[PDB]
Amino acid sequence: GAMNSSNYAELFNNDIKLFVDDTNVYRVTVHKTFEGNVATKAINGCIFTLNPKTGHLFLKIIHTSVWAGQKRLSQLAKWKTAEEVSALVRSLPKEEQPKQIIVTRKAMLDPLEVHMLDFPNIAIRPTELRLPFSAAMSIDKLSDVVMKATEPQMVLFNIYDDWLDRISSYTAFSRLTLLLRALKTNEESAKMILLSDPTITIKSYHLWPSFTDEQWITIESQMRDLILTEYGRKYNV
Amino acid sequence: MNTVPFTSAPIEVTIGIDQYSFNVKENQPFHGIKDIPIGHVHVIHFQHADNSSMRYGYWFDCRMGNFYIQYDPKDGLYKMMEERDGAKFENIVHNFKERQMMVSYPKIDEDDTWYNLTEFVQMDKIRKIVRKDENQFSYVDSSMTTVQENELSDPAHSLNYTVINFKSREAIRPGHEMEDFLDKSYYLNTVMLQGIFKNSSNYFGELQFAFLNAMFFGNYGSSLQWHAMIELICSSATVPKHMLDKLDEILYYQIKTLPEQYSDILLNERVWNICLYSSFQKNSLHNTEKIMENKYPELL
Numbered sequence: 383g384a385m386n387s388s389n390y391a392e393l394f395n396n397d398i399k400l401f402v403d404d405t406n407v408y409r410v411t412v413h414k415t416f417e418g419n420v421a422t423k424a425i426n427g428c429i430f431t432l433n434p435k436t437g438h439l440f441l442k443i444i445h446t447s448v449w450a451g452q453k454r455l456s457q458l459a460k461w462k463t464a465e466e467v468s469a470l471v472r473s474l475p476k477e478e479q480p481k482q483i484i485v486t487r488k489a490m491l492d493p494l495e496v497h498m499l500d501f502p503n504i505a506i507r508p509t510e511l512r513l514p515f516s517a518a519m520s521i522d523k524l525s526d527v528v529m530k531a532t533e534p535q536m537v538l539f540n541i542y543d544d545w546l547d548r549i550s551s552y553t554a555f556s557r558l559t560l561l562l563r564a565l566k567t568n569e570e571s572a573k574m575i576l577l578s579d580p581t582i583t584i585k586s587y588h589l590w591p592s593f594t595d596e597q598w599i600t601i602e603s604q605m606r607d608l609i610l611t612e613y614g615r616k617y618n619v
Numbered sequence: 620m621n622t623v624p625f626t627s628a629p630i631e632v633t634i635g636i637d638q639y640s641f642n643v644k645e646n647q648p649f650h651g652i653k654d655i656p657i658g659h660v661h662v663i664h665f666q667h668a669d670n671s672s673m674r675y676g677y678w679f680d681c682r683m684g685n686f687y688i689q690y691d692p693k694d695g696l697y698k699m700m701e702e703r704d705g706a707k708f709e710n711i712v713h714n715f716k717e718r719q720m721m722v723s724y725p726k727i728d729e730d731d732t733w734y735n736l737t738e739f740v741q742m743d744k745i746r747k748i749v750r751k752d753e754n755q756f757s758y759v760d761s762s763m764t765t766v767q768e769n770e771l772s773d774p775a776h777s778l779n780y781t782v783i784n785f786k787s788r789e790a791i792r793p794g795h796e797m798e799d800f801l802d803k804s805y806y807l808n809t810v811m812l813q814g815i816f817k818n819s820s821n822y823f824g825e826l827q828f829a830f831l832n833a834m835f836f837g838n839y840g841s842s843l844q845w846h847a848m849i850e851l852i853c854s855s856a857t858v859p860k861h862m863l864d865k866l867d868e869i870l871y872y873q874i875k876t877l878p879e880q881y882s883d884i885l886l887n888e889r890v891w892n893i894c895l896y897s898s899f900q901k902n903s904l905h906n907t908e909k910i911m912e913n914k915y916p917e918l919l
């Protein structure tokens with residue numbers, strides 16, 4: 383069934399599942415041509431495939447060369463995403479293959495389903511949640527590896543850093559979606575909040591600063607706070 | 620011309636023959652239907668005055684034997700049967716005609732409707748979809764489910780339509796996922812036409828039988844099967860030109876014959892809007908598009 387607030391704790395049970403987000407797969411800039419017509423230039427993009435229980439992120443980098451000589455690129459993006467997700471599952475040992483894949487956008491259902499025909503026992507599900515995974519490219523280290531890539535490339539991260547050493551998956555995922563929500567609704571302010579203090583560093587093998595427990599409490603409140611201010615500005619409420 | 624005599628009419632019933640129908644009263648002296656045109660399949664179907672649900676009936680071809688109808692008070696239905704004694708049967712027919720207790724198959728000579736609806740339907744293929752090989756004729760009703768319906772219970776009573784599924788390995792070649800799903804040509808032409816049906820006439824034939832079961836019996840899974848077979852052609856970029864033109868004629872006469880009051884239960888909005896306006900073949904069904912627009916603009 384479709385994933386929603388009701389069946390939300392199912393994310394953190396012991397059935398393996400992946401979220402797949404395709405919002406950053408086909409990225410362009412729009413510009414004007416000499417003759418004044420509009421043209422797009424593609425830039426490198428990514429499939430954001432995440433295990434919400436473990437934090438394991440399978441960032442599949444989509445090099446612009448994939449688009450060369452192809453038509454209907456936004457439609458092709460969905461099929462390429464499905465082809466790469468499927469290839470990822472085939473690459474995984476059987477005991478690591480997911481039992482569900484949850485796509486953040488309903489247009490991915492038919493492509494993934496078609497590509498996953500070889501895995502009838504993997505359930506492809508939509509979601510009613512409004513997840514902020516599009517903001518993944520607001521995370522400096524992920525944007526950097528995507529933009530530097532010269533070939534297709536899979537890069538593996540733990541998007542929770544070492545948080546699970548100290549908090550539950552449930553809490554880790556809420557923190558992650560809170561941060562990404564904030565980065566989405568007001569990137570500049572969100573990033574300011576994370577980095578204002580020069581004495582709280584990001585480990586070379588991490589994505590986020592090494593906040594202590596109490597500092598995470600303050601940070602989250604600052605992120606909360608930002609998101610509701612923005613909602614206030616956006617709806618004149 | 621051929622005859623299907625009736626032993627009696629013990630219960631009030633609306634009798635259909637092909638696209639015609641007659642109300643018969645309880646124990647009205649009714650003894651059959653005459654002047655049935657040889658050369659096509661036919662269907663005789665019953666809706667009891669007392670059970671407005673349950674439609675039911677028999678597909679037959681008068682060339683394959685002498686058939687008649689007999690009410691069975693145990694099972695509560697008009698049953699088709701075969702008379703092997705040719706002499707005994709001509710005798711019954713002649714006497715009833717002499718007594719003029721038979722209605723005449725009421726064909727207008729201008730009218731090719733039934734031919735047009737049944738052009739590719741052949742009794743031999745019907746008996747493969749409705750498997751009951753002790754009889755030369757085939758019983759269909761309102762409740763019978765299809766094989767594909769059964770996969771998602773009693774197989775003896777199933778409609779064994781050819782299974783079409785757009786998200787299956789059958790339909791999708793590995794490595795041509797996107798191509799085959801957006802452009803079903805390989806599934807239509809290689810898998811279904813060359814592979815399973817062997818030729819377009821068998822495919823059209825099943826398409827037409829499914830339609831007729833859908834609109835005469837109110838058989839839900841027949842309507843599903845008719846729409847799927849339309850969608851497969853319309854969603855193929857490469858169709859033989861002779862199939863497109865024959866398809867437009869086939870659908871035209873089906874839409875034309877459609878009860879106006881059942882237009883919203885027998886025509887799937889999505890499928891029709893996609894075939895007529897989005898699909899590869901949007902421009903290839905002029906007659907069908909023109910009758911759909913003038914008769915059911917609401918659905919679109």
Ligand SMILES: O=C(N/N=C/c1cccs1)C1CC1
Binds near residue numbers: 834838842884885
């Ligand atoms: O759901 C249905 N209802 N049909 C009613 C009918 C009654 C008599 C003829 S058709 C079937 C798809 C058509």
